[PDB]
């Protein structure tokens, strides 16, 4: 991600391939998770479900 700041940034799926076709019907819990560094595990800053 870049800059961020107080203003919200149009991010995530702009022209990406994150679209997933589900199989079972029901309630699914999608989970965004932010990390400081790009190494496993790193530091999880926040996680909105």
């Amino acid at each position: 991600t870049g800059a961020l700041s107080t203003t919200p940034t149009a991010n995530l799926v702009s022209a990406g391939t994150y679209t997933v076709t589900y199989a079972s019907i029901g309630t699914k819990f999608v989970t965004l998770r932010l990390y400081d560094s790009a190494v496993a595990p790193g530091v999880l800053l926040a996680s909105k479900t």
Binding site: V43, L44, L45, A46, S47
Partner: protein, 49 residues
């Protein structure tokens, strides 16, 4: 030993503040209880009034 402020109560003895080793993710809390509605407590107390 710390007294959590008014409007909670510890009936059981010797429960410590559950900790969190990575704070920026899960914030630590105190193990005293919301003092169920209809009852109040004046700072440290064993049973809500």
């Amino acid at each position: 030993c710390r007294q959590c402020p008014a409007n909670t109560y510890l009936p059981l003895r010797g429960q410590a503040a559950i900790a969190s080793m990575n704070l920026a993710a899960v914030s630590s809390a105190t193990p005293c209880r919301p003092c169920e509605d209809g009852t109040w407590s004046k700072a440290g107390a064993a049973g809500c009034q």
